[PDB]
Amino acid sequence: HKIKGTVVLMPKNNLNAFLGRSVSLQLISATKADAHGKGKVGKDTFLEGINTSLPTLGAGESAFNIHFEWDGSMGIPGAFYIKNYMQVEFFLKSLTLEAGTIRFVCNSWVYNTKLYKSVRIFFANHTYVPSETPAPLVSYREEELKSLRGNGTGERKEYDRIYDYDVYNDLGNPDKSEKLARPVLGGSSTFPYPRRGRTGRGPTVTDPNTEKQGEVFYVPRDENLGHLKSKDALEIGTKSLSQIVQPAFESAFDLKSTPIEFHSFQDVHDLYEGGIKLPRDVISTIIPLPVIKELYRTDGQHILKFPQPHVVQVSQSAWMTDEEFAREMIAGVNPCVIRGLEEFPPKSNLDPAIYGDQSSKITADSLDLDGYTMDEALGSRRLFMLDYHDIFMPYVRQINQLNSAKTYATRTILFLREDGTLKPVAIELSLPHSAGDLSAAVSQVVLPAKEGVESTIWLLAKAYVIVNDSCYHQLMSHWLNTHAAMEPFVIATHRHLSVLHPIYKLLTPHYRNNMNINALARQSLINANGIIETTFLPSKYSVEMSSAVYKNWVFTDQALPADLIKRGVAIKDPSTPHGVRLLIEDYPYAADGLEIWAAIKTWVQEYVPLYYARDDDVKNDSELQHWWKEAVEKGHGDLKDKPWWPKLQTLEDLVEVCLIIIWIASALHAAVNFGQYPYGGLIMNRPTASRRLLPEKGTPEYEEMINNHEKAYLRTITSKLPTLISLSVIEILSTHASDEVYLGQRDNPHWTSDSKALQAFQKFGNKLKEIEEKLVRRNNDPSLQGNRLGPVQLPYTLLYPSSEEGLTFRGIPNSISI
Numbered sequence: 002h003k004i005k006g007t008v009v010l011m012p013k014n015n016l017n018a019f020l021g022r023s024v025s026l027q028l029i030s031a032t033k034a035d036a037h038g039k040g041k042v043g044k045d046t047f048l049e050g051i052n053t054s055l056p057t058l059g060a061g062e063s064a065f066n067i068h069f070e071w072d073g074s075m076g077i078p079g080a081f082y083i084k085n086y087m088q089v090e091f092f093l094k095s096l097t098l099e100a101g102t103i104r105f106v107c108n109s110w111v112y113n114t115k116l117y118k119s120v121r122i123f124f125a126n127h128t129y130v131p132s133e134t135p136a137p138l139v140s141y142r143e144e145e146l147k148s149l150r151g152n153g154t155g156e157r158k159e160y161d162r163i164y165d166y167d168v169y170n171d172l173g174n175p176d177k178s179e180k181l182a183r184p185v186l187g188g189s190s191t192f193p194y195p196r197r198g199r200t201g202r203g204p205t206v207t208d209p210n211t212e213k214q215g216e217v218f219y220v221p222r223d224e225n226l227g228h229l230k231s232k233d234a235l236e237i238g239t240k241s242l243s244q245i246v247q248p249a250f251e252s253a254f255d256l257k258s259t260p261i262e263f264h265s266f267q268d269v270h271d272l273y274e275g276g277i278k279l280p281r282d283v284i285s286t287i288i289p290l291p292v293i294k295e296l297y298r299t300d301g302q303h304i305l306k307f308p309q310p311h312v313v314q315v316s317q318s319a320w321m322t323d324e325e326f327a328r329e330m331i332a333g334v335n336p337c338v339i340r341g342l343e344e345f346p347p348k349s350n351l352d353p354a355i356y357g358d359q360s361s362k363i364t365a366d367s368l369d370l371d372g373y374t375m376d377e378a379l380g381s382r383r384l385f386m387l388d389y390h391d392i393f394m395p396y397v398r399q400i401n402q403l404n405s406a407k408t409y410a411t412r413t414i415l416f417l418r419e420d421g422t423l424k425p426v427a428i429e430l431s432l433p434h435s436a437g438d439l440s441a442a443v444s445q446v447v448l449p450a451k452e453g454v455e456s457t458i459w460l461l462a463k464a465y466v467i468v469n470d471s472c473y474h475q476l477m478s479h480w481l482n483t484h485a486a487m488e489p490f491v492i493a494t495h496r497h498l499s500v501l502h503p504i505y506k507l508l509t510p511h512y513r514n515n516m517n518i519n520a521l522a523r524q525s526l527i528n529a530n531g532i533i534e535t536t537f538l539p540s541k542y543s544v545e546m547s548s549a550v551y552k553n554w555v556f557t558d559q560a561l562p563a564d565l566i567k568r569g570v571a572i573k574d575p576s577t578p579h580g581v582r583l584l585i586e587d588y589p590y591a592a593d594g595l596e597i598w599a600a601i602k603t604w605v606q607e608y609v610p611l612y613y614a615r616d617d618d619v620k621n622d623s624e625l626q627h628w629w630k631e632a633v634e635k636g637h638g639d640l641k642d643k644p645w646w647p648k649l650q651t652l653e654d655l656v657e658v659c660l661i662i663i664w665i666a667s668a669l670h671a672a673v674n675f676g677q678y679p680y681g682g683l684i685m686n687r688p689t690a691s692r693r694l695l696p697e698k699g700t701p702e703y704e705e706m707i708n709n710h711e712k713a714y715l716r717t718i719t720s721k722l723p724t725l726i727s728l729s730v731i732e733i734l735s736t737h738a739s740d741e742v743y744l745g746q747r748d749n750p751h752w753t754s755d756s757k758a759l760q761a762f763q764k765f766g767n768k769l770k771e772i773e774e775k776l777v778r779r780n781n782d783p784s785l786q787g788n789r790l791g792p793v794q795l796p797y798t799l800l801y802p803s804s805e806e807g808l809t810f811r812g813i814p815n816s817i818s819i
């Protein structure tokens with residue numbers, strides 16, 4: 002007659018105020034339906050008291066007792082309605098019905114009832130494909146999806162839970178200045194791009210195609226994760242940095258209270274040793290801000306001290322070695338761009354009518370390949386390259402027209418030595434050339450050198466290459482390939498897969514905080530005059546460059562084996578465990594990556610069969626088919642005309658699509674994100690911009706390379722002010738919040754009632770622990786020291802599955818969470 006229940010919730014910041022007629026719940030039957038096929042609904046039941054029995058209850062949570070009038074004739078409850086009559090919203094954690102037990106995992110904000118068009122509804126933790134949904138819950142299931150989709154119009158509000166798409170037309174700020182106008186990215190052949198979450202603020206006054214400014218960029222409510230500890234709200238750091246800290250830094254420079262430029266490498270090392278001295282009010286503006294205050298140690302008066310980057314913890318000069326420059330292409334912050342080179346000289350697909358003759362000027366006989374001839378090096382698969390020539394050439398002219406920005410389209414040739422390490426053997430610095438060019442600067446090839454002015458020119462050549470790499474890493478490897486590429490799948494999932502769906506349960510953990518960090522990025526990171534535009538080389542051309550690269554983005558090539566084969570760094574080999582043979586045996590990112598990839602694959606292959614017996618069961622899943630069709634045709638719609646999209650009519654295709662999504666969101670993003678401050682915290686190792694081309698002989702700039710090489714280097718790379726800003730942002734992005742959920746973990750042990758699924762997940766977690774033990778053995782193997790540690794003696798731990806909180810250089814989160 003009465004059903005004992007327990008409600009756990011978190012107030013928005015006492016208890017007794019939740020009693021009386023403040024909160025009511027109504028159970029919904031999953032087995033007994035009304036004359037309309039819908040499950041019967043019980044009476045409005047209010048919380049009756051504060052339960053304080055079980056210790057297992059933390060996180061500022063509170064338990065409440067409640068009893069429901071439910072006769073056996075009403076069936077078995079499978080869902081419930083809830084209404085909040087209080088003025089302030091609260092966070093609902095769960096509902097548990099005892100006597101067996103029926104569990105409901107909610108984790109959702111419930112605002113005042115008058116703000117909702119339909120009553121909030123929650124389902125029990127059972128998993129069902131569409132054809133398996135109990136009949137009394139079928140309509141409720143579809144109605145909730147319709148509610149989540151909205152109608153495509155209106156300004157979204159804080160409490161809204163509406164998922165929809167829009168183009169990137171909210172980055173420019175034309176109403177403030179024509180100089181801040183930016184092209185709309187997405188929806189055109191000129192500028193294709195993944196879609197982002199719709200906000201609906203309306204058009205600007207000067208341009209109907211651009212969305213007006215807003216103080217808060219909306220995301221569906223539960224996508225905006227709250228945090229028990231203020232220090233864990235890392236995503237709010239970019240806004241404070243751009244709006245509050247940046248102006249404070251600028252004032253210190255405008256008033257000439259600190260030198261405007263770094264004058265020696267020691268001035269840079271000072272940042273994490275004794276620190277930098279700044280005006281009292283500048284320190285007073287920073288020291289009290291949440292998140293920001295954790296980025297620097299201070300005396301509370303004039304000093305800011307950055308943490309010592311991992312790359313200099315053993316040797317502060319090792320970053321300058323040719324060995325470390327090449328090693329970071331396979332074990333650094335951006336380990337996924339290097340390609341095999343099977344012909345020589347390297348070729349270009351760009352139009353010589355526009356850029357001039359595109360033939361490479363690197364001559365084979367000038368290279369030192371440890372005694373090998375070029376044909377021998379090519380045939381033995383020992384020649385590789387880091388090729389940014391075709392990628393940057395189209396933008397060099399416009400970038401070089403900017404004040405304080407000068408770059409080259411670079412290409413680096415690498416040789417795999419018999420000892421298994423890579424060595425750089427040539428760098429080509431290319432410039433476009435057309436009829437009436439005003440500039441007399443020309444392209445050139447630079448070779449390795451350890452002494453004299455030649456060693457300075459070679460060090461500068463490496464810096465021009467790393468500026469290309471840093472820009473490609475930040476905009477493409479990181480922003481486009483993880484953050485931007487994933488959002489369309491998050492939106493499609495909430496719009497078409499019910500919370501009851503097995504694939505929804507498989508994929509959603511891998512979306513945690515993604516839409517939230519992306520919206521904050523559109524507002525302060527990739528906006529006109531935002532952090533990236535003001536600290537990286539391309540300035541106002543940064544985001545559009547990523548649209549150009551997107552023209553060639555291929556979903557199926559994001560799979561690790563396919564990526565390795567496409568780049569020519571591995572070959573298909575059925576006789577091997579992973580199905581591929583690596584051409585660089587000790588390629589840390591790839592070797593550790595294949596272990597994680599295989600573990601995720603086994604998990605997906607064991608989960609899917611639990612809900613789909615045959616290929617026809619996949620083809621006949623209505624939600625699944627609608628989900629995929631929209632993700633492709635709308636989410637990544639500008640590429641819907643491509644032949645490579647999987648079909649999702651077989652068990653094989655379903656496994657493939659889920660495996661790739663999970664890989665991108667977890668391991669791929671971790672590998673390109675958590676090494677940012679560890680490697681880039683020393684601006685000389687990862688410069689974000691270059692300001693001048695190589696000097697002409699006979700000029701004072703040339704004389705400087707000879708007499709003051711550190712100053713020549715510093716005048717070429719990112720200036721001191723933008724360096725302070727960029728170091729601050731990458732320190733934030735490289736930090737693991739203490740409430741992170743890692744691969745092999747879930748936020749709740751009752752995400753599903755299915756014991757088989759829970760068992761398979763346990764095996765997945767145990768396998769990851771097994772893999773970590775193996776990776777530790779690899780880092781401790783002296784024979785692998787050259788590529789896994791290098792002269793910087795930094796063990797490659799970026800793909801270790803686990804980690805404690807902080808700037809740890811390890812740990813794989815489930816999602817793109819920062």
Ligand SMILES: [Fe+2]
Pocket residue numbers: 479484670674734817818819
């Ligand atoms: Fe990230």
